[PDB]
C-alpha cells in the first residue's frame, strides 16, 4: 500500500461542485526518506523505516535535540541523508518496491481515496469522574450533599475486595487514537499538502501518521 508522515497545521473548509461545504484539515508532509529496508531472514518481518523532518549536524557542546549526535549521524549518512528527527516503521506495504535513500512524494495519493489516521490526543490533567467517564451528577437542592462524586465502590461483606476495572478519577489525555475511513479531497504538489475530509486528533504543530485503509 502506501504511507506518508507529516504535521497537522490547521482546519478550514472548501466548496464542492454542488456548492456544498466539506470540512477539512491541512496536513504538511515534506522531506520524508527511507532509511532501512528490512527482511524476514534477519528480523522476522518485512517493513520500511521512514523519517520525516530534517535537523542539524553534530556539535561539540551539544545540549538540545536540535543538533544531532553520533549514533544518529551514523545512520542518516549510511543511506545518504541528513539527520532525521522523527522515525517510524510501516509494516503493511510491499517491499520489493521502495528502494533505499529515496524520497516519498504525496503524489502517490490520489484525490478521492480512503485512509485511516493515527496520532496523539490532547492533554487534560488530573480530571474527575464525570468529565472523564461521563456519568450522572447528583441533586443540588432538596437538602443534598452529593453533587459531583462517584457514589459507590462495592457491595458488602460479600466480595469485600474492590474489583480492578473500576471507575475513579485520575489522568486522561495523551493516548494513542486512530480514526477509520476518511476521504482524500485534494493533493497539492508544490506546497506538499494533502487534504482530508473530517477532523483528526492532536494539537496544532503535532505529528500525524497517514496510511491506507484495510477495510472494504
Amino acid at each position: 500500500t502506501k504511507g506518508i508522515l507529516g504535521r497537522k497545521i490547521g482546519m478550514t473548509q472548501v466548496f464542492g461542485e454542488n456548492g456544498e461545504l466539506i470540512p477539512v484539515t491541512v496536513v504538511e508532509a515534506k522531506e520524508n526518506v527511507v532509511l532501512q529496508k528490512k527482511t524476514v531472514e534477519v528480523d522476522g518481518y518485512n517493513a520500511i523505516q521512514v523519517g520525516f523532518e530534517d535537523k542539524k549536524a553534530y556539535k561539540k557542546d551539544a545540549k538540545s535535540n536540535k543538533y544531532a549526535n553520533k549514533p544518529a549521524e551514523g545512520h542518516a549518512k549510511k543511506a545518504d541523508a541528513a539527520p532525521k528527527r522523527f522515525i517510524r516503521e510501516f509494516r503493511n506495504v510491499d517491499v520489493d518496491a521502495y528502494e533505499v535513500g529515496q524520497e516519498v512524494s504525496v503524489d502517490t495519493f490520489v484525490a478521492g481515496d480512503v485512509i485511516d489516521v493515527t496520532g496523539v490526543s490532547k492533554g487534560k490533567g488530573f480530571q474527575g469522574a464525570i468529565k472523564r467517564h461521563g456519568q450522572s451528577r447528583g441533586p443540588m437542592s432538596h437538602g443534598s450533599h452529593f453533587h459531583r462524586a462517584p457514589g459507590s465502590v462495592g457491595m458488602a461483606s460479600d466480595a469485600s475486595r474492590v474489583f480492578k476495572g473500576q471507575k475513579m478519577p485520575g489522568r486522561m489525555g495523551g493516548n494513542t487514537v486512530t480514526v477509520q475511513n476518511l476521504e482524500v479531497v485534494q493533493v497539492d504538489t508544490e506546497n506538499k499538502v494533502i487534504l482530508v475530509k473530517g477532523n483528526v486528533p492532536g494539537p496544532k504543530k503535532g505529528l500525524v501518521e497517514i496510511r491506507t485503509s484495510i477495510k472494504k
Partner: protein
C-alpha cells in the same frame, strides 16, 4: 492570516471577486439558484443585514425580513456558487455592529 501562509494559499481558487460591499443596515437582495430537479429557478430572498463575521472562505452574514406576520432569517456564506449575485440598493446609519434589538 500569515501563520506560515499554507492555508490561505490552498484556499485561493475558491474565492470570487464579483460581490459588492455592505455594512450592517444596508438593504440588499440575494439571487439564489435552487436545484429541485433536472433544472430549477432562482427565488430571491430580500431583507436587511444584521450580522457579518469572519475572514476567509468562512465569512458569513445574515439578513432579516418579515413575511405575512412572521419573521424569518437566512444566513449565507459569501463565496458559495449558489448565490448568483448580490444587489445593494440602499444604505443607512447606525451605531452598532451586531443588531439584535430588531428581535
Amino acid at each position: 492570516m500569515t501563520n506560515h501562509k499554507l492555508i490561505e494559499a490552498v484556499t485561493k481558487s475558491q474565492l470570487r471577486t464579483d460581490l459588492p460591499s455592505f455594512r450592517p443596515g444596508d438593504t440588499l437582495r440575494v439571487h439564489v439558484r435552487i436545484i429541485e430537479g433536472t433544472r430549477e429557478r432562482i427565488q430571491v430572498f430580500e431583507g436587511v443585514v444584521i450580522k457579518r463575521r469572519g475572514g476567509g472562505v468562512s465569512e458569513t452574514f445574515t439578513v432579516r425580513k418579515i413575511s405575512s406576520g412572521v419573521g424569518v432569517e437566512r444566513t449565507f456564506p459569501l463565496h458559495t456558487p449558489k448565490i448568483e449575485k448580490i444587489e445593494v440598493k440602499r444604505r443607512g446609519k447606525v451605531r452598532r455592529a451586531k443588531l439584535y434589538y430588531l428581535r
